Amino acid sequence: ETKRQRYNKRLHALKTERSSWEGSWRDISDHIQPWRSRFCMSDSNKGNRHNKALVDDTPFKASRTLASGMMSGLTSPARPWFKLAIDNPELMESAAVKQWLYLVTQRMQSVMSKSNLYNQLHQLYGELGTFGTSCILIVEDKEDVIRAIPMTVGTYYLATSSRGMVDTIYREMRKTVRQLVQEFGLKNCSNSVQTMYDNDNLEAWVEVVHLIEPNKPYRSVYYESGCTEDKLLRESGFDEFPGVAPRWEVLGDDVYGYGPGHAALGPSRSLQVMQKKKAQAVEKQINPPMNVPSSSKSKPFSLLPGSLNYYDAAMGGQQMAQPSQSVNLNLNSIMEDIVAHQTSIKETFYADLVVERLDTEALDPMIDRVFGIMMRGGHLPPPPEEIQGVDLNVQYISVMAQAQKLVGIGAIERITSFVGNLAGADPSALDKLNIDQAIDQYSNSVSAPPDIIRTDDEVAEIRQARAQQQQQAQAMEM
Numbered sequence: 001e002t003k004r005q006r007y008n009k010r011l012h013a014l015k016t017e018r019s020s021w022e023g024s025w026r027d028i029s030d031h032i033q034p035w036r037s038r039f040c041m042s043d044s045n046k047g048n049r050h051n052k053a054l055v056d057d058t059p060f061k062a063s064r065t066l067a068s069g070m071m072s073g074l075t076s077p078a079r080p081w082f083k084l085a086i087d088n089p090e091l092m093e094s095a096a097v098k099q100w101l102y103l104v105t106q107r108m109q110s111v112m113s114k115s116n117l118y119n120q121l122h123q124l125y126g127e128l129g130t131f132g133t134s135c136i137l138i139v140e141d142k143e144d145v146i147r148a149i150p151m152t153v154g155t156y157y158l159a160t161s162s163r164g165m166v167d168t169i170y171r172e173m174r175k176t177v178r179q180l181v182q183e184f185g186l187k188n189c190s191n192s193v194q195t196m197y198d199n200d201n202l203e204a205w206v207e208v209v210h211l212i213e214p215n216k217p218y219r220s221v222y223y224e225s226g227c228t229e230d231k232l233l234r235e236s237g238f239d240e241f242p243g244v245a246p247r248w249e250v251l252g253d254d255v256y257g258y259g260p261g262h263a264a265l266g267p268s269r270s271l272q273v274m275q276k277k278k279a280q281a282v283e284k285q286i287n288p289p290m291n292v293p294s295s296s297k298s299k300p301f302s303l304l305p306g307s308l309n310y311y312d313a314a315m316g317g318q319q320m321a322q323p324s325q326s327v328n329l330n331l332n333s334i335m336e337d338i339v340a341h342q343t344s345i346k347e348t349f350y351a352d353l354v355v356e357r358l359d360t361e362a363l364d365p366m367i368d369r370v371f372g373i374m375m376r377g378g379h380l381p382p383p384p385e386e387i388q389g390v391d392l393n394v395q396y397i398s399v400m401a402q403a404q405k406l407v408g409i410g411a412i413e414r415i416t417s418f419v420g421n422l423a424g425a426d427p428s429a430l431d432k433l434n435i436d437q438a439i440d441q442y443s444n445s446v447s448a449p450p451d452i453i454r455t456d457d458e459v460a461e462i463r464q465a466r467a468q469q470q471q472q473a474q475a476m477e478m
Contacts, residue, residue: 004223004230007211011170014157021256025131025153028261031268032059033130039154041207044174056275058342059268062349063261067126069350074358074398077118079109082367083447085393085401093440096384098450104380104392108367111145111374117366120148124362127153128246129349132259135169135245137212138369145377146370158245158255161214165361166245166255169212172225178202184234190227208233212243240369246362248354264348271341278334281327289324293317359396367394397447405445412442 022039029037030053038044054060075081084101091097112118120136127134135156137149151171159168177196180189186197196204207225212218216237223233247257292298295315302309303321311319346352371392374380383390395401416438422429436459443453 002230003221004232007209007221007223008225010168010213011157011209011211014159014168014170017255018157022154024262024265027265028131029153030054031265031272032063032261033126036127036130036152037154038152041172041174044205053269053272055272055279056342058271059264059345059349062264062346062351063126063130065351066129066260066349067122069353070125070129070355070358071122074355074396075118075121075363076398079113080447081396081398082363083395083397084108085395086387086390087393091386092444094384094386095450095453095455097386100381100383102449107374107380108370111379112370115144115146115148117146117148117370120150123150123152124244124246128248128362129259130261132248132262133158133245133256135166135243137169137242138244138366138373139242140373140376145374145379160253160255164250164253165241166243166247167214167218167241169243169245171210173208173210174205175208176203176205180206180208184222188231188233190224190229190231192227193224212238212241214241218242239372241365242369244362244366244369246358248357260348260350264345267341267345267348271338271345274334274338274341278331278338281329281331281334284325284327285329288327290321291324292321293319295319296321356399359400363396364394405447408445409442412438412445 025037026039032054034052034054035049051057071077084105086092086097086101092101117138124134124136131153134153135151135158137151139147139149141147151173155173156169156171158166158170161167177193180193181197186194189197193206206227209223209225211221213221216239218238218241220234220236220238221232222235248259250257290303292303295317296302296309296311296319298309298321301307368391419430419433436456439453443450
């Protein structure tokens with residue numbers, strides 16, 4: 001058996017496993033976000049996607065608001081959203097290590113700034129809030145160090161490792177011949193793609209399956225499903241898992257997780273039906289059917305505004321048109337339930353205002369993936385020899401491992417005030433200050449550049465010079 005047969009078998013297994021979620025995903029797309037999921041393959045780039053079941057788009061606005069709020073809260077494009085750490089404090093106490101950490105912080109942040117990673121973080125958050133499971137890929141690039149590969153729900157398949165993390169990724173992408181020759185090279189393509197290229201059929205589509213699995217620890221494989229030739233497209237290897245696969249909530253030992261879209265699917269459908277019914281009722285109200293009586297001699301253009309009709313006064317019948325049906329409807333009752341359902345849908349998506357979960361799967365391997373790439377491209381200056389290839393740890397200033405730094409400041413401020421307050425009653429109270437050390441504690445907390453804080457040698461030298469400067473003149477005064 002060749003590798004291609006193994007890949008196809010695993011793809012089929014993943015497909016028959018994922019078959020059970022597609023109905024719910026399609027319902028979510030139809031009734032919450034009908035521009036996201038694209039299970040249909042040939043639909044690629046066929047832009048019709050008419051709003052099919054969403055008369056009232058309140059769930060759509062709610063999901064979008066949730067995505068924007070999560071972006072702003074956690075990884076807002078206002079620059080600071082993370083700080084980098086290493087798992088030994090004594091090395092951190094060295095000025096060189098601190099300066100290198102700040103340098104790698106600046107380089108990381110600038111590089112991710114130049115990249116389009118924030119766009120795909122936006123898309124990831126939106127689709128994760130909507131469908132409950134989303135993923136993006138990060139790969140090296142020339143015009144930019146880190147590039148972000150986006151995929152929408154339905155076009156990719158997932159599997160989880162024994163650790164519970166997502167480790168296997170399959171996806172189907174439709175690419176044109178020109179893209180194939182651009183990214184793989186002509187000589188790696190099959191006979192069909194080659195002969196289409198020589199015929200200058202650049203824009204013709206072709207199915208290609210892209211797959212990431214653990215073994216480099218992770219191997220990448222591309223191949224053309226349509227061209228049954230056993231030759232591969234491209235195989236490579238990854239050191240850290242490139243996939244960013246956050247799941248709102250997982251029941252357990254599952255590969256996809258239900259999200260707020262699942263909870264709001266039902267109420268969305270109920271609200272759509274209620275809106276349709278109310279619209280029908282109002283149409284009945286404002287354009288009722290007309291029962292024009294006989295003996296009115298009503299020519300077709302007799303009910304036109306401004307027209308004057310002349311009727312016999314002898315016939316005492318009701319010479320005046322009347323509505324066809326008696327409707328004494330009240331909109332207050334139905335509108336109450338409509339507003340209640342709207343509010344429930346908004347509160348389902350936190351529109352009035354798991355979040356920490358994105359730290360460990362939506363940010364932890366994203367930073368780890370971008371970590372080695374820039375290092376592979378030497379985008380970071382070499383680290384001090386106190387550390388050797390250490391897989392560095394991340395602190396998320398937005399919400400993670402951040403408050404105690406501020407809390408430590410509060411403890412320091414009260415302690416410094418304590419020594420400060422009795423400084424006005426006893427100078428000897430300042431003896432217990434450890435000033436030379438008090439700067440280090442506050443520094444590590446406020447997240448300031450380490451070049452602000454002078455090293456131990458620098459302080460000693462100036463103090464040594466100061467004492468020598470004072471002693472020399474005082475000795476002559478002696």
